[PDB]
C-alpha cells in the first residue's frame, strides 16, 4: 500500500533548447518500466506541436525513492539519434525477453507548426532490444495499406511470446482500437497481420468523467488487453475490457492466432457501475488483474481464481484524490505494480484540462502481495 514514484506538473526534456516547445503540450499517454535496466520509458504522442522525442527515457537509479527527485527530466531514447526515427507513439510495452515494443502511428495530429518536420508514413510495429546497447531495432513491420483502420485510436496492446527461452520469434502482437471496436493481430513469424471485430469489443454506455465541477462523457471500445498463464502448449487467456464498460472478457490466444477463425469470448462478468477503466494488468504471481480507473481515483483488483467476477470479488489497492484519469498499468520483471494517471481522457478539448496538483502521476507498489494484503484479492478464502 506504500508507493514510490514520480509527479510532474509538466514534462520537461533535458538537452532541448528552452522555449523551443510548450511544456503543457507534452502529454504522456503510457509508459513501460524495464526493472533489470532501471529505465523508464514514456510515450509522448505527437498530438500537439514541437514534441522533441515521442519515445522518452528516464534513468531511475538515482531517482526512485529519493527525496527531491520526484520530477525527472525526459531524455531522448538511447536507441535514437534524432528523435525522428519514430513519428508518434501512444504506448510502450516490454515483453518476456526485454524487447521494447511500440506502435508508430505514422503521422502527427496537428497542421503546420511544423508538422513538415515529421513526414507521414504507414503505421508500423517497431521493437528494440534492451539487452544490447544502444537498444538496436530488431523488429519493424509496416501495416499493409488494405488493413489501416483509424490508427490514431489504438489503445493498449499485448505481446505474446510463445518461446521466451529461445529466439523469441514465435511472437504475436494484439493491438486494441477503441473507436470502432477492433483488434489488430500481427503474426511476427509469418510476417502477416489481420483485423478482428466482435460485438463484445464495443462500448456498453458512455463513461462519466468529472472535470472542474462539470460532468463530461466518452464512449470507448476495447482499450486494454493483458495475457494470462500459458497452458501445456503455449496458449493462454487474453483478458480484455472496453473503456466505456464494466464487463471483462477472456478469449483464448489459440482462437486469436488463427487467421479468419471464429472467436468465442467468455463474459466473466462485471466490476460494478461507474468503475470504467481503460487499462488493466495481469500479475502472474498473485493471479490478480489490476485496473487503473477513469473516474474513481482508484486502482482496483480482482483475483482471477475467485469466480465469477462481481464487485464483491473486487477490492482497492490505491486511492488518491490526485489520481485523475488512470491511463496505463502494468507489472514489471521483478513483480512491481506500476500505474499512471495523466488527466487526459478521450474527450474533446481534454488536452486543455488543467489541475492544481501535478497532472502526470506514475506510481509503483513494490510487490503485488504487499498490495493485496487484507483485501478480497488476497490468497486466503
Swiss-Prot record:
Family statement: Belongs to the major royal jelly protein family.
More info: Vaccination against the protein protects mice from different Leishmania species, such as Leishmania major and Leishmania braziliensis, when infection occurs in the presence of L.longipalpis salivary gland homogenates or after L.longipalpis bites.
Record-listed serotonin binding positions: 327, 342, 344
Pfam families in the cross-refs: MRJP (PF03022)
Predominant location: secreted
Disulfide bonds: 97-168, 301-377
Glycosylated position list: 195
Name recorded for this polypeptide: Yellow-related salivary protein LJM11
GO cellular component: extracellular region
Entry keyword annotation includes Membrane: no
UniProt-listed Gene3D superfamilies: TolB, C-terminal domain
Coiled-coil ranges per UniProt: none
Protein's job: Probably modulates blood feeding of sand flies on vertebrate species by binding and sequestering different mediators involved in the host response. Binds biogenic amines. Binds serotonin with high affinity. Binds adrenaline and noradrenaline. Binds dopamine and octopamine. Poorly binds histamine. Induces a delayed type hypersensitivity response in host tissues. Induces systemic Th1 immune response in the host. Immunogenic; elicits antibody production in the host.
Expressing tissues: Salivary gland (at protein level).
InterPro entries reported in the protein's UniProt record: 6-blade_b-propeller_TolB-like, Royal_jelly/protein_yellow
Amino acid at each position: 500500500a506504500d508507493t514510490q514514484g514520480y509527479k510532474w506538473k509538466q514534462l520537461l526534456y533535458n538537452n532541448v533548447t528552452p522555449g523551443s516547445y510548450n511544456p503543457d503540450n507534452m502529454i504522456s499517454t503510457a509508459f513501460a518500466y524495464d526493472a533489470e535496466g532501471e529505465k523508464l520509458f514514456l510515450a509522448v504522442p505527437r498530438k500537439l506541436p514541437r514534441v522533441p522525442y515521442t519515445l522518452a527515457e528516464v534513468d531511475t537509479k538515482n531517482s526512485l525513492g529519493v527525496k527531491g527527485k520526484h520530477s525527472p527530466l525526459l531524455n531522448k531514447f538511447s536507441g535514437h539519434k534524432t528523435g525522428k526515427e519514430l513519428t508518434s507513439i501512444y504506448q510502450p510495452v516490454i515483453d518476456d525477453c526485454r524487447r521494447l515494443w511500440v506502435v508508430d502511428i505514422g503521422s502527427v495530429e496537428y497542421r503546420s507548426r511544423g508538422a513538415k518536420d515529421y513526414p507521414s508514413h504507414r503505421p508500423a510495429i517497431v521493437a528494440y532490444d534492451l539487452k544490447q546497447p544502444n537498444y538496436p531495432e530488431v523488429v519493424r513491420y509496416y501495416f499493409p495499406t488494405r488493413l489501416v483502420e483509424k490508427p490514431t485510436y489504438f489503445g493498449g496492446f499485448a505481446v505474446d511470446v510463445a518461446n521466451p527461452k529461445g529466439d523469441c520469434s514465435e511472437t504475436f502482437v494484439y493491438i486494441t482500437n477503441f473507436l470502432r471496436g477492433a483488434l489488430f493481430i500481427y503474426d511476427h513469424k509469418k510476417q502477416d497481420s489481420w483485423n478482428v471485430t466482435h460485438p463484445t469489443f464495443k462500448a456498453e454506455r458512455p463513461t462519466k468523467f468529472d472535470y472542474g465541477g462539470k460532468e463530461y462523457e466518452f464512449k470507448a471500445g476495447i482499450f486494454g488487453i493483458t495475457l494470462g498463464d500459458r497452458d501445456s502448449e503455449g496458449n493462454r487467456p487474453a483478458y480484455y475490457l472496453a473503456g466505456s464498460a464494466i464487463k471483462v472478457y477472456s478469449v483464448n490466444t489459440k482462437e486469436l492466432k488463427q487467421k479468419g477463425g471464429k472467436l468465442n469470448p467468455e463474459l466473466l462478468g462485471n466490476r460494478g457501475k461507474y468503475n470504467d477503466a481503460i487499462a488493466l494488468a495481469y500479475d502472474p504471481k498473485t493471479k490478480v488483474i489490476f485496473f487503473a480507473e477513469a473516474n474513481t481515483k482508484q486502482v482496483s483488483c480482482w483475483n482471477t481464481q475467485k469466480m465469477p467476477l462481481r464487485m464483491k470479488n473486487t477490492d482497492v489497492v490505491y486511492t488518491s484524490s490526485r489520481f485523475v484519469f488512470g491511463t496505463d498499468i502494468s507489472v514489471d520483471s521483478k513483480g512491481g505494480l506500476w500505474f499512471m494517471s495523466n488527466g487526459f481522457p478521450p474527450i474533446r478539448k481534454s488536452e486543455k484540462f488543467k489541475y492544481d496538483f501535478p497532472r502526470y502521476r506514475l506510481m509503483r507498489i513494490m510487490d503485488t502481495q504487499e498490495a493485496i494484503a487484507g483485501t478480497a484479492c488476497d490468497m486466503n478464502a
